[model samples]
Target: IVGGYTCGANTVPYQVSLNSGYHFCGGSLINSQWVVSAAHCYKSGIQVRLGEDNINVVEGNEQFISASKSIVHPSYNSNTLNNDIMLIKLKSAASLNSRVASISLPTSCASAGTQCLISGWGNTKSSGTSYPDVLKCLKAPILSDSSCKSAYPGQITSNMFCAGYLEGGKDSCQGDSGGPVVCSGKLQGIVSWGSGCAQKNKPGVYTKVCNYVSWIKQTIASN
Candidate 1:
């Protein structure tokens, strides 16, 4: 994420990287066999890397797995970026441990002023829009519904929420899409978009994860 700091090896055990040859997007492990990411990150031949930190170095705890399926939300709209969530089924179940584990899905929607953790291997964008090798993270608070709407005009929808500074400093940049934003120890949002890396009044926008809980559970049950 932009303006982020290096995160610990096990600080975010549920984090995952979706890669082809290199990291392209971030994801969160919801279960042994399912990962949740952004719809925009969907593509074929994605390799799921879990329990990872310092992508350049092969950590012994990392799990290299393939995606069995990528299920995009039925109501997803690319043009408006509405319903920007997707589910990735792992080719095989990953073993749960201290370094690799699943995070809980949100039980309810998060409100404004809620501080949460956002992490990824995306561009720092401070000195370089260049990507980071080690995982990076930041603590940001959720902006109110009306404030989010004001920032993006007609772009912000009920399924999307804004978080971070109004004056701009930190945000989830490119390559961080599909990453997790956790609140109260539950997965609450997925990095989706922003006006730029970080701009005044253009806080980072995310997929409101709580709205997709039923869809996620139903999809997992049948797929």
Candidate 2:
């Protein structure tokens, strides 16, 4: 997250690091055995790293679990970046405790101007490099689609939304996609993509998790 501050220990108890040899994307522990991630980040053999504040060193609280299966949203549109959320079933369930926990799903959409936390291990750079081997977080308010389209034009869709300051600075970045955008302790968005990190009028875009709430419940129940 560009312009984010390092997170305190267990500050984001539901945060997960989606890994393939190394940290690649962010995810959230939605249940004991399920992870809510981004469609673009899906791949076979991903290892979900949980309960860690830093990826550089082990805190003795991390749980690395192999993914049993991953299901990308059926209607996902890569070109338009629609329906970007994915569900990953863990090989084993995560144990709940101080450093690891599950996040609740929002039942309804959050209106524009609602404050939320965008937390992740995403790189914090719009230019030259580095940070977030330790997790970082920033608070950004949800913006209306009209406001977002002013920057992205026709790209913003029903399943996508924007958040951050129009003045630029303080937004989610590349490695942050698939991370959580939490409001009132509930999952609201998945860090999806954007034009540029913290660019003027171009706030970071997110996968509107509220749109997929029913899908998430149905998929997990039937699978």
Candidate 3:
């Protein structure tokens, strides 16, 4: 899953599955009634599953909530994928338990070279057809903007940053979009896009969450 290994059931309680008939993307529970995801993953009939580790089988701790509204960044650019972030308001508030909790948002930007964790239910390999039933996780190091720019030239904007390997054996892939990139116990990035899955010199790119801190605050407050 997401080019990584299976994770413990409650290791990342904030992890959520964003489903549209099937699990297509990942999300993070920022609050009892709000989820943070990538703008590019937006689609009609999206719902979120919380407190879940396995997607195929329902556990007693799981809570399925329908999305009431999706708030995509007004300035999001599909062409260049700039400002690729979104917020989802749940129809009902989540009932927190040992298997369900909210993640903390970063107060500042993540430093380059920081070791972060990313998890999802995406394919284990880029060309694989099947996704894992259990959530998987892996550790990746954050790449510098200069290094990322070198690989993605003209695509690495202020709203985005990179993480993973230069030699490339691990990184997020399809179905991992909108997942959290947690650094120092806080949500620092959102899985956005990449050249491909775990390709050499092509680190996984993510939306810089710190850049949208004010927008998230304002949106949550106003809505």
Q: Given candidate 2, what's the lDDT at residue 32?
A: 95
Q: How good is model 2 by TM-score?
A: 0.98
Off by over 4 Å in 1: none
Off by over 4 Å in 3: none
Whole-structure CA lDDT of model 2: 0.91
lDDT of 2 by residue, 52-141 (tens): 888889888999999999999999988788999899999999999978999999989999999999999877887857756788999989
Report the CA-based lDDT of candidate 1 relative to the real structure.
0.93
Tens-digit lDDT string for candidate 1 (1-223): 8777888886899999999998999999999999999999999999999989989899788999999999999999999999999999999999999999999998899999999999999888845668888899989999999999999998988899999999888998998899999999999999999988877888999999999999999999999
lDDT of 3: 0.91
Residues 89-176 of candidate 3: C-alpha lDDT, one tens digit per residue? 9999999887899998889999999999999988788555667898989899899999999999989899999999888878888888
Q: What is the C-alpha lDDT of each candidate?
A: 0.93, 0.91, 0.91
State residue 162's C-alpha deviation in candidate 2, in Å.
Answer: 0.4
RMSD (Cα, Å) of candidate 3? 1.0
Query: TM-score for each prediction?
Result: 0.98, 0.98, 0.97
